[PDB]
Design an enzyme around this catalytic site. Structure first.
Site, PDB file in Angstrom:
ATOM      1  N   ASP A  35       0.839  -1.197   0.000  1.00 28.10           N
ATOM      2  CA  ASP A  35       0.000   0.000   0.000  1.00 28.10           C
ATOM      3  C   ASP A  35       0.875   1.248   0.000  1.00 28.10           C
ATOM      4  OD1 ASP A  35      -1.936   1.872   0.288  1.00 28.10           O
ATOM      5  OD2 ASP A  35      -2.444   1.375   2.384  1.00 28.10           O
ATOM      6  N   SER A 199      -0.663  15.551 -12.065  1.00 28.18           N
ATOM      7  CA  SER A 199      -0.882  15.190 -13.454  1.00 28.18           C
ATOM      8  C   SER A 199      -1.126  16.440 -14.276  1.00 28.18           C
ATOM      9  CB  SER A 199      -2.078  14.234 -13.544  1.00 28.18           C
ATOM     10  OG  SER A 199      -2.450  13.991 -14.886  1.00 28.18           O
TER      11      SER A 199
END
EC number: 3.4.23.22
Length: 330
Positions: A35, A199
């Protein structure tokens, strides 16, 4: 040193991925959910409330000659999906794919919430976010990667998740045969303890690319891709009959649909998520309403590049003095 381990989807939907981890002496192998959105290595154990264990493999520290109770240490964690666990702490030897850390904090669960109990395939979590998020008190502990870093050939790990197929976590090296083209690296903020990056935009299907900054986290422990409501609406508007269902808890679409791809930007580069990756199947057995793999982050407080996005790429988690992330097509 290096390590290399195969990671395997837990079910036919890629709801999560499990990677075998050796703990203790002699080794006890548990299948952990790696994770990158959390920083605790915790396991089902001989100390877990018996009624909360339902098929998981347990770590028994009393059977490990290298286990040592970390006196006074406790831990307690709550995840974005509402699940939780807590317990006490041992140090022990932990190996992943041939890479060994001695003295790793292994957090032994005394209690786990129902969603962990109900998932027999996940024996615990191995956190790979920054150690500033680790929950052990009163002495915070380091992640497996943080403990191994100095020994690694290069201070990196990579995630290469498969679509409906196994993939690989590598530690300490970048397998140049595992991706196409070049790796595009992008800046990371560690201020929230995550692999947080920005992004450069998105496209839906064959549509034109929209240049827009989308701050989010690279999170292997989250199944889906969670993005701003504007982006998510633009995606699902291209699927006839798709709608956001408050009763189901997100966007659903007719199972008869062919889904468009979704592209996200990494600097000037582009990662294409095929439409099939966005299909999470019937909302309930036999239903013709299917659950979407791109969902709104509006209720979370952060955008999350979960497995849906990461499995479309070869992803480098660069833990150099200034961390960065790298993405390549594959």
């Amino acid at each position: 040193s290096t390590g290399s381990a195969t990671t395997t989807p837990i079910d036919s939907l890629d709801d999560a991925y499990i990677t075998p981890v050796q703990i203790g002496t002699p080794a006890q192998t548990l299948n952990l959910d790696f994770d990158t959105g959390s920083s605790d290595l915790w396991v089902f154990s001989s100390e877990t409330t018996a009624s909360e264990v339902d098929g998981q493999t347990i770590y028994t520290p009393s059977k490990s000659t290298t286990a040592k109770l970390l006196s006074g240490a406790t831990w307690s964690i709550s995840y974005g999906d509402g699940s939780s666990s807590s317990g006490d702490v041992y140090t022990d030897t932990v190996s992943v794919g041939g890479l060994t850390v001695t003295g790793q904090a292994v957090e032994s669960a005394k209690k786990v919430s129902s969603s962990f109990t109900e998932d027999s395939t996940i024996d615990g979590l191995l956190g790979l976010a920054f150690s500033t998020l680790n929950t052990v008190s009163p002495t915070q502990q380091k992640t497996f990667f943080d403990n191994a870093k100095a020994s690694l050939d290069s201070p990196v790990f990579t995630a290469d998740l498969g679509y409906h197929a196994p993939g690989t976590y590598n530690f300490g090296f970048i397998d140049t045969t595992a991706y196409t083209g070049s790796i595009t690296y992008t800046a990371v903020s560690t201020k929230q303890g995550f692999w947080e990056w920005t992004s450069t935009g998105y496209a839906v299907g064959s549509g034109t690319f929209k240049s827009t900054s989308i701050d989010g986290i690279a999170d292997t422990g989250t199944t889906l891709l969670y993005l701003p409501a504007t982006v998510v609406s633009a995606y699902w508007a291209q699927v006839s009959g798709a709608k956001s269902s408050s009763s189901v808890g997100g966007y659903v679409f007719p199972c008869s649909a062919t889904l468009p791809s979704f592209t996200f930007g990494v600097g000037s580069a582009r990662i294409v998520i095929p439409g099939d990756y966005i299909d999470f199947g019937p909302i309930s057995t036999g239903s013709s309403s299917c659950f979407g793999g791109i969902q709104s982050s509006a209720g979370i407080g952060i955008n999350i590049f979960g497995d849906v996005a990461l499995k479309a790429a070869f992803v480098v988690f660069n833990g150099a003095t200034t961390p960065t992330l790298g993405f390549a097509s594959k």
